[PDB]
Design a protein around this motif. Structure first.
Motif, PDB file in Angstrom:
ATOM      1  N   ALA A   1     -52.454 -47.335  37.289  1.00 46.72           N
ATOM      2  CA  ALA A   1     -52.246 -46.805  35.863  1.00 46.72           C
ATOM      3  C   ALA A   1     -52.871 -47.137  34.141  1.00 46.72           C
ATOM      4  CB  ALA A   1     -50.785 -47.015  35.929  1.00 46.72           C
ATOM      5  N   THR A   2     -52.777 -48.735  34.761  1.00 46.42           N
ATOM      6  CA  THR A   2     -53.970 -48.977  32.934  1.00 46.42           C
ATOM      7  C   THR A   2     -55.072 -48.399  32.775  1.00 46.42           C
ATOM      8  OG1 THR A   2     -52.210 -50.798  33.174  1.00 46.42           O
ATOM      9  CG2 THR A   2     -54.859 -51.024  32.067  1.00 46.42           C
ATOM     10  N   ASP A   3     -55.842 -48.711  34.654  1.00 40.68           N
ATOM     11  CA  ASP A   3     -57.535 -48.262  34.340  1.00 40.68           C
ATOM     12  C   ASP A   3     -57.201 -46.901  34.233  1.00 40.68           C
ATOM     13  OD1 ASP A   3     -57.967 -50.532  35.586  1.00 40.68           O
ATOM     14  OD2 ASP A   3     -57.784 -49.480  37.527  1.00 40.68           O
ATOM     15  N   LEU A   4     -56.382 -45.829  35.113  1.00 35.37           N
ATOM     16  CA  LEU A   4     -56.011 -44.457  34.313  1.00 35.37           C
ATOM     17  C   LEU A   4     -55.925 -43.957  33.618  1.00 35.37           C
ATOM     18  CD1 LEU A   4     -55.362 -43.650  38.278  1.00 35.37           C
ATOM     19  CD2 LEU A   4     -57.163 -43.347  37.753  1.00 35.37           C
ATOM     20  N   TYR A   5     -54.873 -44.187  32.996  1.00 39.53           N
ATOM     21  CA  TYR A   5     -54.104 -43.507  30.977  1.00 39.53           C
ATOM     22  C   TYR A   5     -54.159 -44.546  30.271  1.00 39.53           C
ATOM     23  CZ  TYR A   5     -53.003 -41.037  35.626  1.00 39.53           C
ATOM     24  OH  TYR A   5     -52.876 -39.862  36.168  1.00 39.53           O
ATOM     25  N   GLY A   6     -54.494 -45.846  30.900  1.00 41.19           N
ATOM     26  CA  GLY A   6     -54.440 -47.061  29.475  1.00 41.19           C
ATOM     27  C   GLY A   6     -53.189 -47.567  28.829  1.00 41.19           C
ATOM     28  N   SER A   7     -53.042 -48.797  28.416  1.00 37.79           N
ATOM     29  CA  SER A   7     -52.195 -49.833  29.131  1.00 37.79           C
ATOM     30  C   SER A   7     -50.756 -49.552  28.257  1.00 37.79           C
ATOM     31  CB  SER A   7     -52.799 -51.446  28.518  1.00 37.79           C
ATOM     32  OG  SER A   7     -53.490 -50.473  27.284  1.00 37.79           O
ATOM     33  N   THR A   8     -51.238 -48.341  27.405  1.00 38.30           N
ATOM     34  CA  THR A   8     -49.854 -48.007  26.153  1.00 38.30           C
ATOM     35  C   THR A   8     -49.319 -46.762  26.278  1.00 38.30           C
ATOM     36  OG1 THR A   8     -51.880 -47.224  24.404  1.00 38.30           O
ATOM     37  CG2 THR A   8     -51.488 -49.464  24.064  1.00 38.30           C
ATOM     38  N   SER A   9     -50.085 -46.264  28.183  1.00 42.99           N
ATOM     39  CA  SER A   9     -49.208 -45.096  28.206  1.00 42.99           C
ATOM     40  C   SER A   9     -48.131 -45.017  28.413  1.00 42.99           C
ATOM     41  CB  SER A   9     -50.773 -44.753  28.945  1.00 42.99           C
ATOM     42  OG  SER A   9     -50.380 -45.334  30.722  1.00 42.99           O
ATOM     43  N   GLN A  10     -47.308 -44.038  29.098  1.00 39.93           N
ATOM     44  CA  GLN A  10     -46.325 -43.325  28.884  1.00 39.93           C
ATOM     45  C   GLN A  10     -46.778 -44.097  30.786  1.00 39.93           C
ATOM     46  OE1 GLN A  10     -43.065 -41.304  28.474  1.00 39.93           O
ATOM     47  NE2 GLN A  10     -42.872 -42.779  30.230  1.00 39.93           N
ATOM     48  N   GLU A  11     -47.912 -43.681  31.427  1.00 39.20           N
ATOM     49  CA  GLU A  11     -47.794 -43.954  33.399  1.00 39.20           C
ATOM     50  C   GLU A  11     -47.256 -45.098  32.705  1.00 39.20           C
ATOM     51  OE1 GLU A  11     -49.924 -41.477  31.063  1.00 39.20           O
ATOM     52  OE2 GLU A  11     -49.667 -39.932  31.968  1.00 39.20           O
ATOM     53  N   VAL A  12     -48.096 -46.022  32.816  1.00 39.94           N
ATOM     54  CA  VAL A  12     -48.210 -47.438  32.885  1.00 39.94           C
ATOM     55  C   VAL A  12     -46.609 -48.002  32.592  1.00 39.94           C
ATOM     56  CG1 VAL A  12     -48.203 -49.876  31.917  1.00 39.94           C
ATOM     57  CG2 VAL A  12     -50.318 -48.314  32.597  1.00 39.94           C
ATOM     58  N   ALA A  13     -46.233 -47.351  31.535  1.00 37.20           N
ATOM     59  CA  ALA A  13     -44.265 -47.630  31.162  1.00 37.20           C
ATOM     60  C   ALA A  13     -43.408 -47.094  32.395  1.00 37.20           C
ATOM     61  CB  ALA A  13     -43.943 -46.957  29.801  1.00 37.20           C
ATOM     62  N   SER A  14     -43.600 -46.082  33.181  1.00 38.63           N
ATOM     63  CA  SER A  14     -43.229 -45.436  34.135  1.00 38.63           C
ATOM     64  C   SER A  14     -43.321 -46.430  35.267  1.00 38.63           C
ATOM     65  CB  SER A  14     -43.553 -44.002  34.402  1.00 38.63           C
ATOM     66  OG  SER A  14     -42.443 -43.336  32.799  1.00 38.63           O
ATOM     67  N   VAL A  15     -44.183 -47.060  35.764  1.00 37.82           N
ATOM     68  CA  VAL A  15     -44.650 -47.300  36.561  1.00 37.82           C
ATOM     69  C   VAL A  15     -43.863 -49.254  36.351  1.00 37.82           C
ATOM     70  CG1 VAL A  15     -46.255 -48.924  38.039  1.00 37.82           C
ATOM     71  CG2 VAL A  15     -47.183 -46.446  37.501  1.00 37.82           C
ATOM     72  N   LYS A  16     -43.880 -49.792  35.567  1.00 40.56           N
ATOM     73  CA  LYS A  16     -42.961 -50.618  35.033  1.00 40.56           C
ATOM     74  C   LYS A  16     -41.555 -50.290  35.301  1.00 40.56           C
ATOM     75  CE  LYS A  16     -46.687 -53.027  32.202  1.00 40.56           C
ATOM     76  NZ  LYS A  16     -46.733 -53.198  30.851  1.00 40.56           N
ATOM     77  N   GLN A  17     -40.540 -49.372  34.581  1.00 38.37           N
ATOM     78  CA  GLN A  17     -39.517 -48.995  35.214  1.00 38.37           C
ATOM     79  C   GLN A  17     -38.812 -48.444  36.472  1.00 38.37           C
ATOM     80  OE1 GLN A  17     -39.733 -45.282  32.890  1.00 38.37           O
ATOM     81  NE2 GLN A  17     -39.656 -46.049  30.618  1.00 38.37           N
ATOM     82  N   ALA A  18     -39.681 -48.076  37.560  1.00 36.77           N
ATOM     83  CA  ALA A  18     -39.614 -47.912  38.352  1.00 36.77           C
ATOM     84  C   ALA A  18     -39.678 -49.210  39.646  1.00 36.77           C
ATOM     85  CB  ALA A  18     -40.378 -46.537  38.987  1.00 36.77           C
ATOM     86  N   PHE A  19     -40.534 -49.901  39.434  1.00 35.47           N
ATOM     87  CA  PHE A  19     -40.186 -50.594  40.278  1.00 35.47           C
ATOM     88  C   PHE A  19     -39.149 -52.266  39.370  1.00 35.47           C
ATOM     89  CE2 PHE A  19     -44.519 -49.629  41.687  1.00 35.47           C
ATOM     90  CZ  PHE A  19     -44.728 -50.431  42.780  1.00 35.47           C
ATOM     91  N   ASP A  20     -38.882 -52.289  37.896  1.00 34.46           N
ATOM     92  CA  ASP A  20     -37.837 -52.875  37.514  1.00 34.46           C
ATOM     93  C   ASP A  20     -36.732 -52.271  38.174  1.00 34.46           C
ATOM     94  OD1 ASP A  20     -39.376 -54.874  36.422  1.00 34.46           O
ATOM     95  OD2 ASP A  20     -37.970 -53.266  34.275  1.00 34.46           O
ATOM     96  N   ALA A  21     -36.497 -51.054  38.258  1.00 33.29           N
ATOM     97  CA  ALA A  21     -35.330 -50.300  39.260  1.00 33.29           C
ATOM     98  C   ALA A  21     -34.631 -50.180  40.323  1.00 33.29           C
ATOM     99  CB  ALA A  21     -35.044 -48.372  39.091  1.00 33.29           C
ATOM    100  N   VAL A  22     -35.909 -50.530  41.153  1.00 39.15           N
ATOM    101  CA  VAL A  22     -35.921 -51.463  42.530  1.00 39.15           C
ATOM    102  C   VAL A  22     -36.334 -53.276  42.939  1.00 39.15           C
ATOM    103  CG1 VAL A  22     -36.740 -49.065  43.566  1.00 39.15           C
ATOM    104  CG2 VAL A  22     -37.783 -50.808  43.058  1.00 39.15           C
ATOM    105  N   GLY A  23     -35.562 -53.667  41.553  1.00 41.75           N
ATOM    106  CA  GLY A  23     -36.280 -54.895  41.898  1.00 41.75           C
ATOM    107  C   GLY A  23     -37.253 -55.834  42.049  1.00 41.75           C
ATOM    108  N   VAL A  24     -38.376 -55.876  41.837  1.00 44.73           N
ATOM    109  CA  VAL A  24     -39.317 -55.978  41.800  1.00 44.73           C
ATOM    110  C   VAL A  24     -40.111 -55.757  41.206  1.00 44.73           C
ATOM    111  CG1 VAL A  24     -41.483 -55.598  42.845  1.00 44.73           C
ATOM    112  CG2 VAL A  24     -39.509 -54.871  44.301  1.00 44.73           C
ATOM    113  N   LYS A  25     -40.251 -57.047  40.303  1.00 49.98           N
ATOM    114  CA  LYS A  25     -40.764 -57.818  39.806  1.00 49.98           C
ATOM    115  C   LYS A  25     -41.958 -58.142  39.898  1.00 49.98           C
ATOM    116  CE  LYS A  25     -38.170 -57.631  36.003  1.00 49.98           C
ATOM    117  NZ  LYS A  25     -38.412 -56.673  34.479  1.00 49.98           N
TER     118      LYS A  25
END
Ligand SMILES: [Ca+2]
Ligand SMILES: [Ca+2]
Ligand SMILES: [Ca+2]
Ligand SMILES: [Cl-]
Ligand SMILES: [Cl-]
Ligand SMILES: [Cl-]
Ligand SMILES: [Cl-]
Ligand SMILES: [Zn+2]
Ligand SMILES: [Zn+2]
Ligand SMILES: [Zn+2]
Ligand SMILES: [Zn+2]
Ligand SMILES: [Zn+2]
Ligand SMILES: [Zn+2]
Length: 316
Positions: A292-316
């Motif tokens: 997601a960083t490659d595609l949309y940038g490190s500050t993007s919504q897309e990166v933030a949402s990937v992190k949120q989703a893995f947080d939600a399922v308990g994967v760090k």
């Protein structure tokens, strides 16, 4: 076989009518010359010998019940080809336009379908647990995606790597189902599972626990059955993927959904550029974040949402 490219018509396992690309040489064959090095569909004649005989039909009409599994294996292989080509610029499962061969009527009452390393193989089901499994586009594309994985990351079919392998196939099986507009959903196998029971499926990506699969890393299966839970623990990644696409709040973590196309771009890039045979869930998170960083940038919504989703399922 050599011949003239033709277009037949038939009905699939569920009675739906569709055109199929065929080849005429005395008979009309399930040979589609329009996609790569071809899509070829075979009659296994209830044997286990593969591939069987290239499917031949006298009149280019495929409305017999015996025809229906071949119609769908052939057509849905073509849809899967079109998805990978038009969405990911990937030409067939190996990216080099390899022929896609499928055999139907494999064995008797066989409740399974699989990519065997060289071709697709479809049982007819026993009529209670399954009807002919090529009737499910998500099943077709799930198994063909195992071939994509074999030709890219090479994820091993055990433990967390194997659950990622399974989830990748469920994710792209589902994205193919949406691409086709084949009554899409975030369930797997609903079109061919239990004809006597409406509204069920093999597993749910939106709610894995519906069928007892985990939706959080803390609920993962740790035993030795099912190659270390590869069809069970896939629910953890499937739910993360569902959240990335559709958003939602899961175990108190709010995920801002970014839609199906971006989910697919992120996971396709992770699979083809970053995953390795032994990637675990934590490493999949890292690969998805980097993709997601490659595609949309490190500050993007897309990166933030990937992190949120893995947080939600308990994967760090
Ligand atoms: Ca016919
Ligand atoms: Ca489905
Ligand atoms: Ca059912
Ligand atoms: Cl839910
Ligand atoms: Cl849930
Ligand atoms: Cl949700
Ligand atoms: Cl929840
Ligand atoms: Zn399988
Ligand atoms: Zn699988
Ligand atoms: Zn569906
Ligand atoms: Zn499986
Ligand atoms: Zn939830
Ligand atoms: Zn949810």
């Amino acid at each position: 076989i050599t011949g003239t490219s033709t277009v037949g018509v038939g009905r699939g396992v569920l009675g739906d009518q569709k055109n199929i690309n065929t080849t005429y040489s005395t008979y009309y064959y399930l040979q589609d010359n329009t996609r790569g090095n071809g899509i070829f569909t075979y009659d296994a004649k209830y044997r286990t010998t593969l591939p069987g005989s290239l499917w031949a039909d006298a009149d280019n009409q495929f409305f017999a019940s015996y025809d229906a599994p071949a119609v769908d294996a052939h057509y849905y292989a073509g849809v899967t080809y079109d998805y990978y080509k038009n969405v990911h610029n990937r030409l067939s499962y190996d990216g080099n336009n390899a022929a896609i061969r499928s055999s139907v009527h494999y064995s008797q009452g066989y409740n399974n379908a699989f990519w065997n390393g060289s071709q697709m193989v479809y049982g007819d089901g026993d009529g209670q647990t399954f009807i002919p499994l090529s009737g499910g586009i998500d099943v077709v594309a799930h198994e063909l995606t195992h071939a994509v994985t074999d030709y890219t990351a090479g994820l091993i079919y055990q433990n967390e790597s194997g659950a990622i392998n399974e989830a990748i196939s469920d994710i792209f099986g589902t994205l193919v189902e949406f691409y086709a507009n084949k009554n899409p959903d975030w369930e797997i196998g609903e079109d061919v599972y239990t004809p006597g029971i409406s509204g069920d499926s093999l597993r749910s990506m939106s709610d894995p626990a519906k069928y007892g699969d985990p939706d959080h890393y803390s609920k993962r299966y740790t035993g030795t059955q099912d190659n270390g839970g590869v069809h069970i623990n896939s629910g953890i990644i499937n739910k993360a993927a569902y959240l990335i696409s559709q958003g939602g709040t899961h175990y108190g973590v709010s995920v801002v959904g970014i839609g199906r196309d971006k989910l697919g771009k992120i996971f396709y890039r992770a699979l083809t550029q970053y995953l390795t045979p032994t990637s675990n869930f934590s490493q999949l998170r890292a690969a998805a974040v980097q993709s997601a960083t490659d595609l949309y940038g490190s500050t993007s919504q897309e990166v933030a949402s990937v992190k949120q989703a893995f947080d939600a399922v308990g994967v760090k």
